[PDB]
Design a protein around this nucleic acid. Structure first.
Ligand SMILES: [Mg+2]
Ligand SMILES: [Mg+2]
Ligand SMILES: [Mg+2]
Ligand SMILES: [Mg+2]
Ligand SMILES: [Mg+2]
Ligand SMILES: [Mg+2]
Ligand SMILES: [Mg+2]
Ligand SMILES: [Mg+2]
Ligand SMILES: [Mg+2]
Ligand SMILES: [Mg+2]
Ligand SMILES: [Mg+2]
Ligand SMILES: [Mg+2]
Ligand SMILES: [Mg+2]
Ligand SMILES: [Mg+2]
Ligand SMILES: [Mg+2]
Ligand SMILES: [Mg+2]
Ligand SMILES: [Mg+2]
Ligand SMILES: [Mg+2]
Ligand SMILES: [Mg+2]
Ligand SMILES: [Mg+2]
Ligand SMILES: [Mg+2]
Ligand SMILES: [Mg+2]
Ligand SMILES: [Mg+2]
Ligand SMILES: [Mg+2]
Ligand SMILES: [Mg+2]
Ligand SMILES: [Mg+2]
Ligand SMILES: [Mg+2]
Ligand SMILES: [Mg+2]
Ligand SMILES: [Mg+2]
Ligand SMILES: [Mg+2]
Ligand SMILES: [Mg+2]
Ligand SMILES: [Mg+2]
Ligand SMILES: [Mg+2]
Ligand SMILES: [Mg+2]
Ligand SMILES: [Mg+2]
Ligand SMILES: [Mg+2]
Ligand SMILES: [Mg+2]
Ligand SMILES: [Mg+2]
Ligand SMILES: [Mg+2]
Ligand SMILES: [Mg+2]
Ligand SMILES: [Mg+2]
Ligand SMILES: [Mg+2]
Ligand SMILES: [Mg+2]
Ligand SMILES: [Mg+2]
Ligand SMILES: [Mg+2]
Ligand SMILES: [Mg+2]
Ligand SMILES: [Mg+2]
Ligand SMILES: [Mg+2]
Ligand SMILES: [Mg+2]
Ligand SMILES: [Mg+2]
Ligand SMILES: [Mg+2]
Ligand SMILES: [Mg+2]
Ligand SMILES: [Mg+2]
Ligand SMILES: [Mg+2]
Ligand SMILES: [Mg+2]
Ligand SMILES: [Mg+2]
Ligand SMILES: [Mg+2]
Ligand SMILES: [Mg+2]
Ligand SMILES: [Mg+2]
Ligand SMILES: [Mg+2]
Ligand SMILES: [Mg+2]
Ligand SMILES: [Mg+2]
Ligand SMILES: [Zn+2]
Lengths: 98, 43, 52, 50
RNA sequence: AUCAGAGUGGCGCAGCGGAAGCGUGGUGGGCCCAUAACCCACAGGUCCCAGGAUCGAAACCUGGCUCUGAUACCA
RNA sequence: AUGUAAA
RNA sequence: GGGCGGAAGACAUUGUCAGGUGGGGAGUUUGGCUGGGGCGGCCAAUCUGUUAAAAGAUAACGCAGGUGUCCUAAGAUGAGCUCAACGAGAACAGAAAUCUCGUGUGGAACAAAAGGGUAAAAGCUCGUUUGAUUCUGAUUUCCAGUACGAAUACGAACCGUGAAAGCGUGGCCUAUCGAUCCUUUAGAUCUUCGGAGUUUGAAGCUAGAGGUGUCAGAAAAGUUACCACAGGGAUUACUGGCUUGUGGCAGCCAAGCGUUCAUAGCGACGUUGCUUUUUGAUCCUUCGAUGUCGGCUCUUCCUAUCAUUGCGAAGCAGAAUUCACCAAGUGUUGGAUUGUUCACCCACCAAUAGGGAACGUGAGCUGGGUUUAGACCGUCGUGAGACAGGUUAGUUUUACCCU
RNA sequence: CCGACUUUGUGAAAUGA
RNA sequence: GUGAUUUCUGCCCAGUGCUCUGAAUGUCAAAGUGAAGAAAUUCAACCAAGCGCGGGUAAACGGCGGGAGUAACUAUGACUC
RNA sequence: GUAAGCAGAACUGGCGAUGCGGGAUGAACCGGAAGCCGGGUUACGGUGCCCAACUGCGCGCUAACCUAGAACCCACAAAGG
RNA sequence: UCGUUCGUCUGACUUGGGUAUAGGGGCGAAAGACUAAUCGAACCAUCUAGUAGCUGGUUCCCUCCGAAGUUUCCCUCAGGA
RNA sequence: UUGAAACACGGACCAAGGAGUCUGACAUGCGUGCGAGUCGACGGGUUCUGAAACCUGGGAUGCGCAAGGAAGCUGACGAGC
């Protein structure tokens, strides 16, 4: 899977609302905040005795992840995000087919 | 800890660490070496 | 499991020392001015077997 | 102990106990799902009838 | 009985599709009175068989053949 | 390293 | 001299937090389907063909295969062309390099299994591209007419391509995938933090991603022969029942053997049966219990006849032996080794045939084996322990009822 | 087992800021 | 742990364990320290034991291989690969 | 699957849930489904005795010194003479 | 328990009384042995009418209507929707 | 239970006792009363067999009379075939 470095698709911003040229990057998960209410509630739940209080997943079967593309149009500098089919090897702006 | 089995044997190393809990520290406690003493270590 | 033999000895119960026929503790005499600065003369009266 | 069993035995009998019902035929059939362009116009034509 | 493994130079072994070698053994010179040892060269292969895909196979899947280890309990 | 049984 | 005498000395120790170690100990878990269970497999999500009985649906641990991917092109569109293979030709050039003409219904190609589909294409080459886009509804397959996955037809937009009609909402069609809670991202110059504001932080709304393959989605290792409980004949191990592959017995045909002669005695290649002392297959009966090997003891029954009686045939001279008939009246032993059934030797004998009776027979015995708890060895296991491996020691209850 | 703080005061030097 | 006396206790420290050693420029907490900010906080440097690195140890748990050829009858194989 | 009173499917009916007549006996085979009675007639099946109903009227075949043979399912018999 | 027969009998000997150890505790020349006929965790009371998708039972009459063993999902297959 | 007279379990006999109840929430159906209302259910007053009965409050207690939104918020302009 090779993806172009730029792409012209619809932009839904109220200042664009049309096809514009977009910049194509890849999504990566932001690092978890310690002050998210879920994190807070869990840390309170873990304190003291009783051990592990929430389940811990073990049974991994998926060997891939759906790749997300972060498309930034070059007129308002707002992003859209679209997921593509699961792939093992992925590349943006790689060398073209012959 | 050494008990049991269809043959009498220890089944684990008989040297136990110094910081082992009581009831677990049986055998050769915190042993630096085992076996027959020869040469310098017999001195 | 159950409490092993090595653990049972610290409670004392049947593992205390067998000292009914012993003759008292064996030691020097409490150190005093006589022994610090000179000599005190003693006489040996008996040589006795101490059980245990 | 062989716990999988399938059959259509007795099922046509159960179906025909209370008949094979057909839905009631209706004057002024339903327009839900038709062409929205066609339906707007039909609504507008009826709005301006005299 | 099923299933894992392994079939490559004379022998024991490596080989990750561009694709064949390591030790030892063979052959011809040299050294020696003469053999070994040593020195210089030279030649080796139905890659177990039949397929099939593959830029392209000894290697990758399928079938066939032969050697080896395994698990086969409660009654 | 070693040295025809063939006298 | 207001120091009982020494040693250490603001380190030890104590108290509170922090990290590490911790089967010494606590609690708990240790899927399912399954021709018993276990081990194996995956028939649990899931596609093609077939089974499938010409609508649709349709099972099995049925059959032959497939799936967790891959692709900025292998997506979109336009134009031009035609493929496999074969024939005939051209220096090196041959079976096979490149070129040329003819034939060419697809015998090629289309990412992958299978099936279907496609020829101025759906294949090949070239151009231009991003409809693999935005919004929310509808329908189809599944189906409870729920969700997901996937697909289809419009509506409202913005674009690609092409002169244009048109075509385009990924891959020619049928598989290629994922709830709540949580986290994380994008979107509004959005809503709230409840005394009012500014202003970080947090909390929401809409839409994605991080995954649950046991695939409508618990966070999970063994062993028990020291064992327990609720149940199960929905389910194994023994008799009984169905079957008869396998075991045993028997026929038919007759190529050959039988020094010549198919059939005295045999009988290959083929084929038809019977039997129910084997085992296999099954799971109908019994798990609020039908005492589970063998021997000993005793009786009875069958014939598929070993000897004994009467016969028929012969490659029957005699002696012996063999095949067959009528025949179950009578008989079929003593021992070495083994728990053995079985076996195999020794010996006698007229002969030492073959079987059944809940694999006859434990309130008849016995208890050698197997089959609890003790213990040893070997192999396995980190261990508890396992062994369809060997070994040794290990309780055998009741009749007086009816027949 | 290990560290900080507490118990925990006194004063001297060497590298440190 | 083994089990009188007698005779004898071979090879293996790679694994599991036990243990020894700390140069320091691996990792590893709370506390303490520095910076940014209006603060909450964040970030960086540092961070003891442990682990990793390096030694020892089998009368510690335990383990202690294959395949071809080869002697002038044959067999076998002291010998060789 | 060699097969099975075996395992798994398709359509219909039955039993399960249902007595009654027949098949001697039987859950599902044949007839037929039902309040308590009188009279008549039938279905399946029968008419020598058991046992209600002919030892009825006809025509052939069979002679078994093997238990002749004699009831849809159904309680077998084959190749071959 | 009884009969006969056996093991030991100056010793790690037999035995009375006193005293110590108490339940995940004791004590064990080790058999998971013994701890008042109770031991792979005593006994007594309470929590407690513990829970059971599992077995057993579940009390009067007549009259009328009258099934299902099939679909989908479920650590679901003796259960439930 | 597919199938029981069963070589499936329970039942020697008799008497007495012996098992879908009470409560809370909700739902459909039915009955009663009132009706855009309706409840007097915590209290108060009164009541001489009555712990009963009878009176009183409610101008906002519950439910209903209005909904959509996460929220800030907004909140049914009058129906034809
Ligand atoms: Mg707290
Ligand atoms: Mg804590
Ligand atoms: Mg233990
Ligand atoms: Mg052991
Ligand atoms: Mg043992
Ligand atoms: Mg071992
Ligand atoms: Mg079922
Ligand atoms: Mg040479
Ligand atoms: Mg030479
Ligand atoms: Mg020599
Ligand atoms: Mg020599
Ligand atoms: Mg535990
Ligand atoms: Mg199971
Ligand atoms: Mg099985
Ligand atoms: Mg059909
Ligand atoms: Mg069809
Ligand atoms: Mg075209
Ligand atoms: Mg759908
Ligand atoms: Mg369109
Ligand atoms: Mg295409
Ligand atoms: Mg998701
Ligand atoms: Mg959130
Ligand atoms: Mg506030
Ligand atoms: Mg599921
Ligand atoms: Mg357990
Ligand atoms: Mg066992
Ligand atoms: Mg047979
Ligand atoms: Mg046979
Ligand atoms: Mg059964
Ligand atoms: Mg059975
Ligand atoms: Mg039973
Ligand atoms: Mg009995
Ligand atoms: Mg019984
Ligand atoms: Mg009996
Ligand atoms: Mg006979
Ligand atoms: Mg008996
Ligand atoms: Mg015995
Ligand atoms: Mg035993
Ligand atoms: Mg054994
Ligand atoms: Mg008697
Ligand atoms: Mg030792
Ligand atoms: Mg040794
Ligand atoms: Mg080692
Ligand atoms: Mg080591
Ligand atoms: Mg820190
Ligand atoms: Mg450190
Ligand atoms: Mg029933
Ligand atoms: Mg009548
Ligand atoms: Mg006795
Ligand atoms: Mg005596
Ligand atoms: Mg005596
Ligand atoms: Mg005494
Ligand atoms: Mg005493
Ligand atoms: Mg034991
Ligand atoms: Mg109760
Ligand atoms: Mg039941
Ligand atoms: Mg049954
Ligand atoms: Mg019976
Ligand atoms: Mg029962
Ligand atoms: Mg009884
Ligand atoms: Mg009563
Ligand atoms: Mg009101
Ligand atoms: Zn934009």
């Amino acid at each position: 899977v090779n993806v172009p470095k730029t792409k012209k698709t619809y932009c839904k911003n109220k200042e664009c609302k049309k096809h514009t040229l977009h910049k194509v990057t890849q999504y990566k998960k932001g690092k978890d905040s310690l002050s998210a209410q879920g994190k807070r509630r869990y840390d309170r739940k873990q304190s003291g005795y009783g051990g592990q209080t929430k389940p811990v997943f073990h049974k991994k079967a998926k060997t891939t992840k759906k790749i997300v593309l972060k498309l930034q149009c070059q007129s308002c500098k707002h992003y859209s995000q679209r997921a593509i089919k699961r792939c093992k090897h992925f590349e943006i702006g790689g060398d073209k087919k012959g | 800890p050494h008990g049991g089995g269809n043959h009498q044997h220890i089944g684990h190393a008989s040297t136990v660490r110094r910081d082992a809990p009581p009831g677990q520290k049986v055998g050769l406690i915190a042993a630096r070496r085992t076996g027959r003493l020869r040469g310098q270590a017999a001195a | 499991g159950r409490v092993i033999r090595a653990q049972r000895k610290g409670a004392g119960s049947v593992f205390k020392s067998h000292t009914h026929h012993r003759k008292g503790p064996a030691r020097f005499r409490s150190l005093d001015f006589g022994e610090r600065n000179g000599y005190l003369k003693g006489v040996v009266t008996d040589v006795i077997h101490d059980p245990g | 102990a062989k716990s999988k069993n399938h059959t259509a035995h007795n099922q046509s009998y159960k179906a025909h106990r209370n008949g094979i019902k057909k839905p009631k035929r209706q004057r002024q059939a339903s327009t839900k799902g038709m062409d929205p362009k066609f339906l707007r116009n039909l609504r507008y034509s009826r709005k301006h009838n005299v």
